[PDB]
Amino acid sequence: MRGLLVGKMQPFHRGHLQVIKSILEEVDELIICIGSAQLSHSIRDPFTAGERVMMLTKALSENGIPASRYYIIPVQDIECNALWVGHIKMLTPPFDRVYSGNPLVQRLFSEDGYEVTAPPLFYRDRYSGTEVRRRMLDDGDWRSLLPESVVEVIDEINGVERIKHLA
Amino acid sequence: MRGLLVGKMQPFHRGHLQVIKSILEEVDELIICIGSAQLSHSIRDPFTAGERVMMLTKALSENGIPASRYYIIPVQDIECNALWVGHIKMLTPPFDRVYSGNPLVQRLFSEDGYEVTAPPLFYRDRYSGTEVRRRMLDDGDWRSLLPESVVEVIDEINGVERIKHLA
Amino acid sequence: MRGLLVGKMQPFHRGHLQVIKSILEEVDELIICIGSAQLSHSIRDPFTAGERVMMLTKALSENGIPASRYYIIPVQDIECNALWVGHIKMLTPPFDRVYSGNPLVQRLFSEDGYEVTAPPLFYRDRYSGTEVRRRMLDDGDWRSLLPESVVEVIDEINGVERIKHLA
Amino acid sequence: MRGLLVGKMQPFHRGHLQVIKSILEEVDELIICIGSAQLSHSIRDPFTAGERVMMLTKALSENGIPASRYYIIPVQDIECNALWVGHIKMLTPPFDRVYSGNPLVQRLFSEDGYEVTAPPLFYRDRYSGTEVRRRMLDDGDWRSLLPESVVEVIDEINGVERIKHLA
Amino acid sequence: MRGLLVGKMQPFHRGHLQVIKSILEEVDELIICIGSAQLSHSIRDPFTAGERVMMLTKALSENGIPASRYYIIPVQDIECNALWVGHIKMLTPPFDRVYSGNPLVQRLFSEDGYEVTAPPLFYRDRYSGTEVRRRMLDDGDWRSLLPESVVEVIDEINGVERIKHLA
Amino acid sequence: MRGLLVGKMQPFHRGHLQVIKSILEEVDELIICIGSAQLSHSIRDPFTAGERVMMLTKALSENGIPASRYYIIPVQDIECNALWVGHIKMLTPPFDRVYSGNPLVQRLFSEDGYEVTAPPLFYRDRYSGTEVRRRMLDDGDWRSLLPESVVEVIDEINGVERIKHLA
Ligand SMILES: NC(=O)c1ccc[n+]([C@@H]2O[C@H](COP(=O)([O-])OP(=O)(O)OC[C@H]3O[C@@H](n4cnc5c(N)ncnc54)[C@H](O)[C@@H]3O)[C@@H](O)[C@H]2O)c1
Ligand SMILES: NC(=O)c1ccc[n+]([C@@H]2O[C@H](COP(=O)([O-])OP(=O)(O)OC[C@H]3O[C@@H](n4cnc5c(N)ncnc54)[C@H](O)[C@@H]3O)[C@@H](O)[C@H]2O)c1
Ligand SMILES: NC(=O)c1ccc[n+]([C@@H]2O[C@H](COP(=O)([O-])OP(=O)(O)OC[C@H]3O[C@@H](n4cnc5c(N)ncnc54)[C@H](O)[C@@H]3O)[C@@H](O)[C@H]2O)c1
Ligand SMILES: NC(=O)c1ccc[n+]([C@@H]2O[C@H](COP(=O)([O-])OP(=O)(O)OC[C@H]3O[C@@H](n4cnc5c(N)ncnc54)[C@H](O)[C@@H]3O)[C@@H](O)[C@H]2O)c1
Ligand SMILES: NC(=O)c1ccc[n+]([C@@H]2O[C@H](COP(=O)([O-])OP(=O)(O)OC[C@H]3O[C@@H](n4cnc5c(N)ncnc54)[C@H](O)[C@@H]3O)[C@@H](O)[C@H]2O)c1
Ligand SMILES: NC(=O)c1ccc[n+]([C@@H]2O[C@H](COP(=O)([O-])OP(=O)(O)OC[C@H]3O[C@@H](n4cnc5c(N)ncnc54)[C@H](O)[C@@H]3O)[C@@H](O)[C@H]2O)c1
């Protein structure tokens, strides 16, 4: 039983970790696709796919989740939404269920015949990429929104200095 | 200490496994990029990136190599060789050394300032994607050239029927 | 005498039908290019090119316009506006006049040396893709804005459920 | 009942016409996709998609086949074969059966769950794009291989002068 | 000693000329990249790369700056910001310093290890592409913001008629 | 009076220099487009566009040709030959005549309505990119085929070591 979760992870936050843990209770393995893998250095998409791979890797490992239970696969975006589900299938192992709170992702997989689950949102008011990046820019408390390992990655790659300069 | 290995893995064979094991003796983790992730269903590139991810995953796991010791990242090809090293960096975790027997890959990383190691070839006369695919097409003994787990993947996805039809 | 009409047809409405009929009174055949053929599943561009081909086909046929009097050709968008006129020429039969109310389309063809006609707008306050899609989303009366055959196509492909989910 | 036929039509020849007529005896409408719509001015792909649209249109009309019985849709090629079937679906009306003698096309649609029919070849030794273009270049008898209407199109667009210059 | 300046030059204005002159006092040659070379015919990017090449050429020549002191190189934009610095390097001669007031350009080159200088802004309230284009559209005094040679180019290519039609 | 010359310049050789000098006797300025600006690090296309810009610049300057008499513009290739002439126009200043010995280039510009001149070939048996690169690889005398300034550029960028490694 393999599930699929897709997200920009800009950056990977506590909401992401929580949903992943719950998902791992109903599936044997979880395919985690880092979408928009081609975007980086913008206010909405500051981190490269590689930096995000490290964020995910450290965070999951830090939380004791065995690496054998998940796949981290960067996925560049494409121009045709009608071909995106096929695009994901082509780059990933086979999967039985799709977990997503993103309307577009839900509708695309739904139309393709996949069962789509929308997990309950975990503190959607604070655990969102938008809030995290807003706090980084306005000097708010973004650190509490992310697993400690992610904060370390961001510090190491000078993530805040980057996003502030770009803004 | 993290190394980087790039290959089409069309399909993943015993030569690949051997070089990976030796590399894992000098580095802590190995980033394994599956190149030409956009190509599939052709005589030279029959398998999708996703099918190759499964081949690698099963094979490495079958050989007792812990998943925490490697990263499997599909990498689509790009038009400009001059930007390829940057392309790889953008999609991967940081790495210290590059292992490759491919002249182009060696020269590109070399010009970029990376130390490149060309591991000794393991039975280059039989352990090559070209030979494997040739045997699949001419009904030769391709199975002995691949780890058992890879053969199982190919059987499951009807790899031989596909490549034969395409030829 | 062949004319050219380009439009997103998202979806094909009564305004489109009316302008086509009038155009067919001054030209022998009309080339109808469905622009942005690569876009689908978005609030501004909900339908695939194929679904739009059916909308046009059924509507024109429903209105007794012989198929021998027009060409339905999907045209993907391209990055360079400076090459778009050439892009259209490359995918279509030769044409003598261009009919369009779109400023960009008018200027591009004009600069290329083509005579461009801007037909009078037919109820521009209700007959527009924007209004149709707005009514579909807010449960307004979108059906009256489209030929009956188009409504049937939309019902069949669950167009409203799609656009509502995406919103 | 709608069928699908895909071909480069470089140029449209008597073999194409014959297979289309037979297909039209088992389906109500035939979707005819002109593949490699982006290629032109090369020895293997001399004609633009638009020129080919005219070739098909004139030929089918010349042979009394009603325009309401077919769709002529140019389809640009894409880099990922794994997404091509989806690419075709996205640009076309729905279809029940696929007719093709091309191994790749057959395997792709087959893997996607479509029934694929390989019509008998009509004089494959003379009725092929390769032979036609070879005769045009070596001053052989290419005219007898094409419907008269197609020859007229080629004469009008100076097709032979083009291909000879390119060679 | 060679410097690098990148800009859309939509259109080339007095601010551009001033910064170039000052830069030419600290470097032997200046590489001038016209960014977004693929965009044209839009309100934000009205002129083609070729038209901009003429604007730069005439203006610099008009101001007595020898052609041997600079390189005018059109550079199309790319999807990955992470590869852009590499993209520029690939299309240009080697350079020692980068001059730019654009935050993104500064951060990208900075992260790549280049020294980046942000020249003082020359009348930023009037000397900006945005103001120039705004005046062209609202019939303001755009001519005083540009070198005379640039105005002549714009008049010759009917730049104002174009941008007004597009708006 | 402005002419246009397009070439890969892989690398710029004595034949190129000779044709340019003769052309400069009938035109006031010469636009020199370095085609395939996106290709580098391959046996057929070893040098980046930037390296070629330097080769041209040094060679022309070395031969006393004033920089004000020419434009060096890198041009990436595109997928549609039917749009290439438009692609060139978009990136360059206006031109009156096209000089080329390349059949494709000649036919494309010819069909677009341009007068195309095919200058006499200068020692075509030795002055060709193919011969130069062949000698570099087989240790033949490639230096005599290129202007001295070009040899210096190649030495400086380790061009021979690169092409030999790639082979
Ligand atoms: N055509 C295309 O190229 C195309 C089409 C669709 C989607 N995409 C890609 O999909 C990606 C979008 O992913 P996204 O917007 O979902 O990214 P995201 O990082 O914001 O969200 C990832 C997922 O995590 C979960 N999640 C997020 N916050 C949560 C919280 N607080 N509590 C619980 N669960 C939470 C949701 O399932 C969500 O979908 C992008 O890369 C986009 O480009 C591409
Ligand atoms: N511009 C670009 O897009 C660009 C530039 C360079 C390379 N690439 C990509 O790089 C990939 C090519 O990888 P490849 O040709 O090396 O693939 P491969 O699967 O044939 O080889 C993978 C690697 O495995 C090792 N190996 C193979 N056989 C072995 C044996 N018998 N014994 C020991 N070691 C062995 C070598 O290090 C080799 O490089 C492609 O996807 C290519 O497109 C892309
Ligand atoms: N570079 C590029 O890729 C490029 C450049 C220009 C245009 N395009 C494409 O052109 C398409 C845009 O077409 P559009 O905006 O005109 O689509 P549309 O469907 O809104 O309008 C189609 C045409 O129908 C007519 N029309 C619409 N409503 C009417 C009414 N009520 N009464 C009478 N006539 C009416 C007008 O002539 C109009 O231009 C897009 O696909 C766009 O991407 C592409
Ligand atoms: N990834 C991709 O972009 C991708 C993948 C697959 C195919 N394609 C496209 O498919 C197209 C290829 O079409 P093709 O090679 O079949 O073109 P074609 O014109 O040679 O043949 C068209 C079809 O006509 C029929 N036919 C041809 N000669 C005949 C004869 N003498 N008698 C009877 N029937 C005959 C066959 O069914 C054949 O497949 C190309 O445009 C190719 O690029 C694209
Ligand atoms: N990924 C990518 O494709 C990518 C990433 C970064 C940048 N770019 C490209 O970079 C280009 C952007 O250039 P831009 O925004 O700087 O263009 P611009 O023409 O507005 O400015 C050009 C430069 O001129 C100088 N300048 C402008 N006005 C001045 C004034 N009044 N006084 C003094 N100096 C002045 C500044 O150094 C400025 O950066 C675009 O083509 C963009 O697409 C591309
Ligand atoms: N669709 C497209 O992207 C498309 C279409 C056509 C051409 N192109 C581009 O055009 C470029 C090809 O240029 P090319 O093949 O001519 O390059 P080249 O460097 O071999 O030749 C350049 C030109 O120099 C002249 N020349 C060469 N050797 C000479 C000699 N010994 N004596 C006298 N004159 C001599 C000829 O006019 C020749 O065309 C490529 O970059 C190609 O990709 C692109």
Side-chain angles (χ1 to χ4, degrees):
Chain A
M1 182 61 96
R2 202 140 49 212
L4 166 77
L5 175 72
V6 181
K8 309 175 84 70
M9 312 307 192
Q10 287 284 14
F12 185 73
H13 53 67
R14 291 182 179 291
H16 289 133
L17 182 60
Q18 178 58 61
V19 73
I20 288 174
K21 289 184 178 177
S22 51
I23 290 174
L24 286 172
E25 301 186 307
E26 47 182 295
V27 301
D28 296 301
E29 310 183 327
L30 177 59
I31 296 170
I32 302 170
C33 290
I34 297 171
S36 300
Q38 82 285 352
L39 304 177
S40 76
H41 302 74
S42 80
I43 301 303
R44 289 87 65 71
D45 302 80
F47 311 113
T48 65
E51 300 172 331
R52 284 173 274 166
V53 166
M54 284 291 86
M55 291 178 197
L56 270 65
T57 291
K58 298 295 178 59
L60 299 171
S61 182
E62 175 176 64
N63 276 266
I65 299 170
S68 59
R69 298 205 63 196
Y70 64 76
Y71 305 77
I72 300 179
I73 303 177
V75 175
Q76 304 195 58
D77 293 330
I78 63 175
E79 189 170 48
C80 307
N81 286 327
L83 305 188
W84 190 71
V85 164
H87 180 60
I88 294 299
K89 289 181 178 180
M90 173 193 90
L91 303 165
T92 64
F95 49 89
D96 307 287
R97 304 188 65 67
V98 177
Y99 301 81
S100 179
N102 184 293
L104 177 52
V105 171
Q106 304 178 322
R107 184 66 194 188
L108 292 181
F109 272 102
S110 180
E111 279 179 36
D112 192 70
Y114 280 84
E115 282 183 295
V116 181
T117 295
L121 298 181
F122 195 58
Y123 288 119
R124 48 184 169 60
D125 292 299
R126 50 186 56 56
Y127 294 171
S128 73
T130 307
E131 178 66 10
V132 171
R133 299 189 300 273
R134 180 178 306 171
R135 294 193 186 182
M136 297 181 142
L137 291 173
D138 307 324
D139 294 313
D141 176 34
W142 55 273
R143 292 194 174 71
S144 65
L145 280 31
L146 322 175
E148 287 287 57
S149 53
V150 180
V151 170
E152 299 180 2
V153 170
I154 294 170
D155 281 345
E156 176 70 313
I157 66 173
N158 295 137
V160 183
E161 273 169 48
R162 176 189 298 168
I163 204 171
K164 279 192 168 190
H165 187 166
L166 299 178
Chain B
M1 182 61 96
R2 202 140 49 212
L4 166 77
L5 175 72
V6 181
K8 309 175 84 70
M9 312 307 192
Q10 287 284 14
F12 185 73
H13 53 67
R14 291 182 179 291
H16 289 133
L17 182 60
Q18 178 58 61
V19 73
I20 288 174
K21 289 184 178 177
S22 51
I23 290 174
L24 286 172
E25 301 186 307
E26 47 182 295
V27 301
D28 296 301
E29 310 183 327
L30 177 59
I31 296 170
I32 302 170
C33 290
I34 297 171
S36 300
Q38 82 285 352
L39 304 177
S40 76
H41 302 74
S42 80
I43 301 303
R44 289 87 65 71
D45 302 80
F47 311 113
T48 65
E51 300 172 331
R52 284 173 274 166
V53 166
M54 284 291 86
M55 291 178 197
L56 270 65
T57 291
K58 298 295 178 59
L60 299 171
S61 182
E62 175 176 64
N63 276 266
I65 299 170
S68 59
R69 298 205 63 196
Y70 64 76
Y71 305 77
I72 300 179
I73 303 177
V75 175
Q76 304 195 58
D77 293 330
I78 63 175
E79 189 170 48
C80 307
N81 286 327
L83 305 188
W84 190 71
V85 164
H87 180 60
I88 294 299
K89 289 181 178 180
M90 173 193 90
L91 303 165
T92 64
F95 49 89
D96 307 287
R97 304 188 65 67
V98 177
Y99 301 81
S100 179
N102 184 293
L104 177 52
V105 171
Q106 304 178 322
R107 184 66 194 188
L108 292 181
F109 272 102
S110 180
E111 279 179 36
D112 192 70
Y114 280 84
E115 282 183 295
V116 181
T117 295
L121 298 181
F122 195 58
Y123 288 119
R124 48 184 169 60
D125 292 299
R126 50 186 56 56
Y127 294 171
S128 73
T130 307
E131 178 66 10
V132 171
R133 299 189 300 273
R134 180 178 306 171
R135 294 193 186 182
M136 297 181 142
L137 291 173
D138 307 324
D139 294 313
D141 176 34
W142 55 273
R143 292 194 174 71
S144 65
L145 280 31
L146 322 175
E148 287 287 57
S149 53
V150 180
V151 170
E152 299 180 2
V153 170
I154 294 170
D155 281 345
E156 176 70 313
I157 66 173
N158 295 137
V160 183
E161 273 169 48
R162 176 189 298 168
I163 204 171
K164 279 192 168 190
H165 187 166
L166 299 178
Chain C
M1 182 61 96
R2 202 140 49 212
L4 166 77
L5 175 72
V6 181
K8 309 175 84 70
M9 312 307 192
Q10 287 284 14
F12 185 73
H13 53 67
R14 291 182 179 291
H16 289 133
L17 182 60
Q18 178 58 61
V19 73
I20 288 174
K21 289 184 178 177
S22 51
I23 290 174
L24 286 172
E25 301 186 307
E26 47 182 295
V27 301
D28 296 301
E29 310 183 327
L30 177 59
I31 296 170
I32 302 170
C33 290
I34 297 171
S36 300
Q38 82 285 352
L39 304 177
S40 76
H41 302 74
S42 80
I43 301 303
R44 289 87 65 71
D45 302 80
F47 311 113
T48 65
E51 300 172 331
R52 284 173 274 166
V53 166
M54 284 291 86
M55 291 178 197
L56 270 65
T57 291
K58 298 295 178 59
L60 299 171
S61 182
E62 175 176 64
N63 276 266
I65 299 170
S68 59
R69 298 205 63 196
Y70 64 76
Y71 305 77
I72 300 179
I73 303 177
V75 175
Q76 304 195 58
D77 293 330
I78 63 175
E79 189 170 48
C80 307
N81 286 327
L83 305 188
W84 190 71
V85 164
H87 180 60
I88 294 299
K89 289 181 178 180
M90 173 193 90
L91 303 165
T92 64
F95 49 89
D96 307 287
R97 304 188 65 67
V98 177
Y99 301 81
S100 179
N102 184 293
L104 177 52
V105 171
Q106 304 178 322
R107 184 66 194 188
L108 292 181
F109 272 102
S110 180
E111 279 179 36
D112 192 70
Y114 280 84
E115 282 183 295
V116 181
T117 295
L121 298 181
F122 195 58
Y123 288 119
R124 48 184 169 60
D125 292 299
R126 50 186 56 56
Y127 294 171
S128 73
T130 307
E131 178 66 10
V132 171
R133 299 189 300 273
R134 180 178 306 171
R135 294 193 186 182
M136 297 181 142
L137 291 173
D138 307 324
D139 294 313
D141 176 34
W142 55 273
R143 292 194 174 71
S144 65
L145 280 31
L146 322 175
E148 287 287 57
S149 53
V150 180
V151 170
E152 299 180 2
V153 170
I154 294 170
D155 281 345
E156 176 70 313
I157 66 173
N158 295 137
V160 183
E161 273 169 48
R162 176 189 298 168
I163 204 171
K164 279 192 168 190
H165 187 166
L166 299 178
Chain D
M1 182 61 96
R2 202 140 49 212
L4 166 77
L5 175 72
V6 181
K8 309 175 84 70
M9 312 307 192
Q10 287 284 14
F12 185 73
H13 53 67
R14 291 182 179 291
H16 289 133
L17 182 60
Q18 178 58 61
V19 73
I20 288 174
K21 289 184 178 177
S22 51
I23 290 174
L24 286 172
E25 301 186 307
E26 47 182 295
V27 301
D28 296 301
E29 310 183 327
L30 177 59
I31 296 170
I32 302 170
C33 290
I34 297 171
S36 300
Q38 82 285 352
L39 304 177
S40 76
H41 302 74
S42 80
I43 301 303
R44 289 87 65 71
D45 302 80
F47 311 113
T48 65
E51 300 172 331
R52 284 173 274 166
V53 166
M54 284 291 86
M55 291 178 197
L56 270 65
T57 291
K58 298 295 178 59
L60 299 171
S61 182
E62 175 176 64
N63 276 266
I65 299 170
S68 59
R69 298 205 63 196
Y70 64 76
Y71 305 77
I72 300 179
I73 303 176
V75 175
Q76 304 195 58
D77 293 330
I78 63 175
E79 189 170 48
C80 307
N81 286 327
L83 305 188
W84 190 71
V85 164
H87 180 60
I88 294 299
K89 289 181 178 180
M90 173 193 90
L91 303 165
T92 64
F95 49 89
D96 307 287
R97 304 188 65 67
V98 177
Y99 301 81
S100 179
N102 184 293
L104 177 52
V105 171
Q106 304 178 322
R107 184 66 194 188
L108 292 181
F109 272 102
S110 180
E111 279 179 36
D112 192 70
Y114 280 84
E115 282 183 295
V116 181
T117 295
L121 298 181
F122 195 58
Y123 288 119
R124 48 184 169 60
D125 292 299
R126 50 186 56 56
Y127 294 171
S128 73
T130 307
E131 178 66 10
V132 171
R133 299 189 300 273
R134 180 178 306 171
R135 294 193 186 182
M136 297 181 142
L137 291 173
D138 307 324
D139 294 313
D141 176 34
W142 55 273
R143 292 194 174 71
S144 65
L145 280 31
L146 322 175
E148 287 287 57
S149 53
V150 180
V151 170
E152 299 180 2
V153 170
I154 294 170
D155 281 345
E156 176 70 313
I157 66 173
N158 295 137
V160 183
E161 273 169 48
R162 176 189 298 168
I163 204 171
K164 279 192 168 190
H165 187 166
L166 299 178
Chain E
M1 182 61 96
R2 202 140 49 212
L4 166 77
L5 175 72
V6 181
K8 309 175 84 70
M9 312 307 192
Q10 287 284 14
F12 185 73
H13 53 67
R14 291 182 179 291
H16 289 133
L17 182 60
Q18 178 58 61
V19 73
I20 288 174
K21 289 184 178 177
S22 51
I23 290 174
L24 286 172
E25 301 186 307
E26 47 182 295
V27 301
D28 296 301
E29 310 183 327
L30 177 59
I31 296 170
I32 302 170
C33 290
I34 297 171
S36 300
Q38 82 285 352
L39 304 177
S40 76
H41 302 74
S42 80
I43 301 303
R44 289 87 65 71
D45 302 80
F47 311 113
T48 65
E51 300 172 331
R52 284 173 274 166
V53 166
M54 284 291 86
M55 291 178 197
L56 270 65
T57 291
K58 298 295 178 59
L60 299 171
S61 182
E62 175 176 64
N63 276 266
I65 299 170
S68 59
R69 298 205 63 196
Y70 64 76
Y71 305 77
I72 300 179
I73 303 177
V75 175
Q76 304 195 58
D77 293 330
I78 63 175
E79 189 170 48
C80 307
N81 286 327
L83 305 188
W84 190 71
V85 164
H87 180 60
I88 294 299
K89 289 181 178 180
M90 173 193 90
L91 303 165
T92 64
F95 49 89
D96 307 287
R97 304 188 65 67
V98 177
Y99 301 81
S100 179
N102 184 293
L104 177 52
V105 171
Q106 304 178 322
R107 184 66 194 188
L108 292 181
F109 272 102
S110 180
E111 279 179 36
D112 192 70
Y114 280 84
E115 282 183 295
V116 181
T117 295
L121 298 181
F122 195 58
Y123 288 119
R124 48 184 169 60
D125 292 299
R126 50 186 56 56
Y127 294 171
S128 73
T130 307
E131 178 66 10
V132 171
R133 299 189 300 273
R134 180 178 306 171
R135 294 193 186 182
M136 297 181 142
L137 291 173
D138 307 324
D139 294 313
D141 176 34
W142 55 273
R143 292 194 174 71
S144 65
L145 280 31
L146 322 175
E148 287 287 57
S149 53
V150 180
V151 170
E152 299 180 2
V153 170
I154 294 170
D155 281 345
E156 176 70 313
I157 66 173
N158 295 137
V160 183
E161 273 169 48
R162 176 189 298 168
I163 204 171
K164 279 192 168 190
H165 187 166
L166 299 178
Chain F
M1 182 61 96
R2 202 140 49 212
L4 166 77
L5 175 72
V6 181
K8 309 175 84 70
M9 312 307 192
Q10 287 284 14
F12 185 73
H13 53 67
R14 291 182 179 291
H16 289 133
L17 182 60
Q18 178 58 61
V19 73
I20 288 174
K21 289 184 178 177
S22 51
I23 290 174
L24 286 172
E25 301 186 307
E26 47 182 295
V27 301
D28 296 301
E29 310 183 327
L30 177 59
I31 296 170
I32 302 170
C33 290
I34 297 171
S36 300
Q38 82 285 352
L39 304 177
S40 76
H41 302 74
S42 80
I43 301 303
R44 289 87 65 71
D45 302 80
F47 311 113
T48 65
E51 300 172 331
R52 284 173 274 166
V53 166
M54 284 291 86
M55 291 178 197
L56 270 65
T57 291
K58 298 295 178 59
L60 299 171
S61 182
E62 175 176 64
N63 276 266
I65 299 170
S68 59
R69 298 205 63 196
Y70 64 76
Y71 305 77
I72 300 179
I73 303 177
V75 175
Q76 304 195 58
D77 293 330
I78 63 175
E79 189 170 48
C80 307
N81 286 327
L83 305 188
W84 190 71
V85 164
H87 180 60
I88 294 299
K89 289 181 178 180
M90 173 193 90
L91 303 165
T92 64
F95 49 89
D96 307 287
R97 304 188 65 67
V98 177
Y99 301 81
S100 179
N102 184 293
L104 177 52
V105 171
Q106 304 178 322
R107 184 66 194 188
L108 292 181
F109 272 102
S110 180
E111 279 179 36
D112 192 70
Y114 280 84
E115 282 183 295
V116 181
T117 295
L121 298 181
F122 195 58
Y123 288 119
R124 48 184 169 60
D125 292 299
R126 50 186 56 56
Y127 294 171
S128 73
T130 307
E131 178 66 10
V132 171
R133 299 189 300 273
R134 180 178 306 171
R135 294 193 186 182
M136 297 181 142
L137 291 173
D138 307 324
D139 294 313
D141 176 34
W142 55 273
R143 292 194 174 71
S144 65
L145 280 31
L146 322 175
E148 287 287 57
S149 53
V150 180
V151 170
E152 299 180 2
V153 170
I154 294 170
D155 281 345
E156 176 70 313
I157 66 173
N158 295 137
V160 183
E161 273 169 48
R162 176 189 298 168
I163 204 171
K164 279 192 168 190
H165 187 166
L166 299 178

